[PDB]
Amino acid sequence: SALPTPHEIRNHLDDYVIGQEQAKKVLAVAVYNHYKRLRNGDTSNGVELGKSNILLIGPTGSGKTLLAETLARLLDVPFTMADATTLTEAGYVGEDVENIIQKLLQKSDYDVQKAQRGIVYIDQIDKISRKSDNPSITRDVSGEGVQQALLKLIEGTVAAVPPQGQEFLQVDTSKILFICGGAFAGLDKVISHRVETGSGIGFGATVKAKSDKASEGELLAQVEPEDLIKFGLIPEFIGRLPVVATLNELSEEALIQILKEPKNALTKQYQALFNLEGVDLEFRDEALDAIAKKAMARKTGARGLRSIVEAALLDTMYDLPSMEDVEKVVIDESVIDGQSEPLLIYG
Amino acid sequence: ALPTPHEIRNHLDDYVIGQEQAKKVLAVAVYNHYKRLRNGDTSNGVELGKSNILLIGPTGSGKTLLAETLARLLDVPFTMADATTLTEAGYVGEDVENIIQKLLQKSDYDVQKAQRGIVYIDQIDKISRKSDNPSITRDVSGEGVQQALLKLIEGTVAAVPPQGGRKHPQQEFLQVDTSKILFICGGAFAGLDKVISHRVETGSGIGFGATVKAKSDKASEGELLAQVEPEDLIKFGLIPEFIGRLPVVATLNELSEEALIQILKEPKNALTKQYQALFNLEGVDLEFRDEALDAIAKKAMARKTGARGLRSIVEAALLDTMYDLPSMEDVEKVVIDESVIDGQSEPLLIYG
Ligand SMILES: Nc1ncnc2c1ncn2[C@@H]1O[C@H](COP(=O)(O)OP(=O)(O)OP(O)(O)=S)[C@@H](O)[C@H]1O
Numbered sequence: 001s002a003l004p005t006p007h008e009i010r011n012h013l014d015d016y017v018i019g020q021e022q023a024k025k026v027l028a029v030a031v032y033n034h035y036k037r038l039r040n041g042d043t044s045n046g047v048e049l050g051k052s053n054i055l056l057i058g059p060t061g062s063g064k065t066l067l068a069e070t071l072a073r074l075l076d077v078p079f080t081m082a083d084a085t086t087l088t089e090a091g092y093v094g095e096d097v098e099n100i101i102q103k104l105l106q107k108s109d110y111d112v113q114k115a116q117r118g119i120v121y122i123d124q125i126d127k128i129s130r131k132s133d134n135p136s137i138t139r140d141v142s143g144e145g146v147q148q149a150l151l152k153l154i155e156g157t158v159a160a161v162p163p164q165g166q167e168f169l170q171v172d173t174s175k176i177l178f179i180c181g182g183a184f185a186g187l188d189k190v191i192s193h194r195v196e197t198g199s200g201i202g203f204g205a206t207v208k209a210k211s212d213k214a215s216e217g218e219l220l221a222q223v224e225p226e227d228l229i230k231f232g233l234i235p236e237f238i239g240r241l242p243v244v245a246t247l248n249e250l251s252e253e254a255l256i257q258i259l260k261e262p263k264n265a266l267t268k269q270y271q272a273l274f275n276l277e278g279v280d281l282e283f284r285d286e287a288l289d290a291i292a293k294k295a296m297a298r299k300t301g302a303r304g305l306r307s308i309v310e311a312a313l314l315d316t317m318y319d320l321p322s323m324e325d326v327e328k329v330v331i332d333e334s335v336i337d338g339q340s341e342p343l344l345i346y347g
Numbered sequence: 348a349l350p351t352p353h354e355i356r357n358h359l360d361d362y363v364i365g366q367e368q369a370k371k372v373l374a375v376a377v378y379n380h381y382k383r384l385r386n387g388d389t390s391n392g393v394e395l396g397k398s399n400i401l402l403i404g405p406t407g408s409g410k411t412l413l414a415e416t417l418a419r420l421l422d423v424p425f426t427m428a429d430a431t432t433l434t435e436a437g438y439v440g441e442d443v444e445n446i447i448q449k450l451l452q453k454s455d456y457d458v459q460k461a462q463r464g465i466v467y468i469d470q471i472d473k474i475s476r477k478s479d480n481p482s483i484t485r486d487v488s489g490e491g492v493q494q495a496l497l498k499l500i501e502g503t504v505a506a507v508p509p510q511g512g513r514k515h516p517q518q519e520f521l522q523v524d525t526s527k528i529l530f531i532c533g534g535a536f537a538g539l540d541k542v543i544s545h546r547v548e549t550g551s552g553i554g555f556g557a558t559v560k561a562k563s564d565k566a567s568e569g570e571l572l573a574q575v576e577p578e579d580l581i582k583f584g585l586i587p588e589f590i591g592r593l594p595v596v597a598t599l600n601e602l603s604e605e606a607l608i609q610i611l612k613e614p615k616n617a618l619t620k621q622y623q624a625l626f627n628l629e630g631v632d633l634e635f636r637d638e639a640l641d642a643i644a645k646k647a648m649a650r651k652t653g654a655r656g657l658r659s660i661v662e663a664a665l666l667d668t669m670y671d672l673p674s675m676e677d678v679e680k681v682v683i684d685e686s687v688i689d690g691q692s693e694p695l696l697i698y699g
Pocket residue numbers: 016017018019058059060061062063064065066067182183258262302303
């Protein structure tokens with residue numbers, strides 16, 4: 001009963017994700033090492049084995065949420081996908097932190113011994129951060145307060161969970177892994193202050209003003225915990241998440257592979273959408289390069305790609321069901337620009 | 348015979364390093380708790396007092412670790428609760444009495460054995476009153492929790508449903524005294540250094556006569572917390588009536604460059620021993636030369652996160668090696684060099 005390896009688990013995520021080689025290594029080692037700590041019954045010399053959570057950081061639509069979703073498929077141990085926006089500071093009307101553990105049991109069928117060895121993922125983590133409110137004039141119930149509650153959850157404790165909705169079940173969390181990730185906004189500006197040192201207003205001071213500092217791919221790599229403190233996160237919270245994963249923006253070359261290599265790509269989606277209708281679909285390489293340039297200008301990422309395709313094919317889809325004897329559709333580069341219309345084959 | 352402070356401290360030293368004054372406070376309390384417990388109103392003196400503990404220190408200093416290691420050697424029951432999940436006597440979050448309920452689970456519902464137990468609370472700063480908040484409001488999380496704990500630290504009796512009850516039929520509760528129960532509250536306070544500076548330095552004068560700050564780095568956190576007093580905590584948000592219940596105070600100094608080196612080798616549960624055991628099952632050995640450990644100390648202190656921010660320095664380095672180590676075969680030992688920590692070199696692998 002040999003366990004999988006990082007090279008093996010990386011091959012699975014590579015089929016669904018592209019151009020995130022640095023981040024996939026982190027999830028592979030954590031998942032790999034998670035089975036090792038579970039394999040040991042706390043009997044070896046290395047008693048009280050340490051834990052190492054993960055903090056995923058990337059631009060918008062870079063594929064953070066997709067990694068955690070595809071991971072749960074091949075994962076044997078349970079998995080959940082919660083959100084931090086709905087949390088509150090232990091007593092307000094929104095929600096409690098313990099609800100995350102409740103969702104985990106639904107996947108494990110209320111198996112405590114099986115749920116303790118599970119994995120947890122959190123999305124939209126940047127929402128819980130002091131918005132330039134370090135003095136803390138008032139208490140943030142949806143922000144700072146949430147981080148304070150999660151502090152003990154990442155270390156390990158026991159939390160009451162109503163089974164099935166006057167007793168409660170205790171579920172340890174010292175061995176549970178957490179993968180928190182949320183695209184941070186404005187983080188590039190704070191990191192620039194530490195490394196720019198280029199105000200240059202006086203005579204002696206030097207003003208670079210080359211506009212090259214705004215390189216997200218190269219700027220996030222230089223991140224550190226101190227940079228997050230100025231953002232709003234508490235140091236106590238970051239210490240619970242030692243590992244950090246930085247994701248690069250999507251380049252023009254990477255976007256082309258997203259439409260062909262992944263099985264769940266949009267090209268294969270529409271290909272099957274028309275397959276049921278008895279019509280073939282095609283996408284030439286000349287059209288893919290033009291779509292990549294149009295998406296990067298939108299500053300939205302992979303998620304802002306459907307707007308380029310659906311808008312281009314909206315007119316064709318409207319009149320396609322009424323049309324008969326059409327077996328194939330070809331989309332040229334001019335169609336995206338709007339100069340020409342898609343070519344339809346009859347037969 | 349009962350344990351001794353030197354013996355109980357020698358045990359904690361195996362799991363904790365670089366905290367001399369903090370270990371002394373816990374030893375005297377535990378050593379004195381058995382005395383008050385052994386002779387309850389069975390001596391010439393009567394009305395034996397009590398002295399709780401208030402642990403204060405930076406992040407990753409070892410506050411939560413002392414409570415865990417203490418439970419291993421402690422005979423009487425012990426628990427590890429939290430203050431973030433508490434509400435003010437009626438709201439939806441939680442009641443203060445849940446702390447006593449958790450104590451009975453470990454004591455097997457032994458009321459006589461539960462009153463003689465010890466209690467620990469973590470993250471006490473999270474219930475600190477916001478000094479200047481809107482007057483028309485109610486701080487159920489921060490002010491209410493302190494108000495509720497007042498009678499608890501002093502001594503009272505609280506209703507506790509035993510086992511939760513089978514149904515409405517029972518509708519009874521058990522009384523559990525708390526006058527003899529010890530409480531060890533602790534939590535990293537944020538912004539406390541700024542409060543002591545205003546009271547101690549009393550400068551920040553732009554004028555000529557006023558003395559301006561000599562350097563940017565001043566008022567060392569370790570040396571600044573030592574000058575703490577109860578009046579400082581009042582400006583933080585705590586109520587004097589609550590702090591009066593916790594007379595003893597312990598100031599934990601931040602980590603030192605030499606202390607971090609000892610934490611990886613002297614303790615039994617050190618990270619080096621953890622990773623060594625991680626590869627021991629894999630049939631692979633490991634090495635960590637002192638030339639690399641001292642270099643890691645500079646990287647950790649730069650983060651200003653504490654000992655808990657050390658895994659980021661190690662796992663970020665060994666991420667590449669662990670990724671391809673299982674696929675590789677005929678490898679028996681691994682060597683770690685100083686350059687690898689810097690990132691300019693690749694760790695050497697010993698074939699076999
Ligand atoms: N590498 C990728 N390969 C293929 N599709 C991708 C990739 N990255 C993103 N996508 C697409 O983008 C969609 C959403 O990606 P997400 O994982 O949500 O990105 P994100 O960083 O999580 O954005 P946020 O943080 O949720 S606003 C996916 O369902 C895919 O359709």
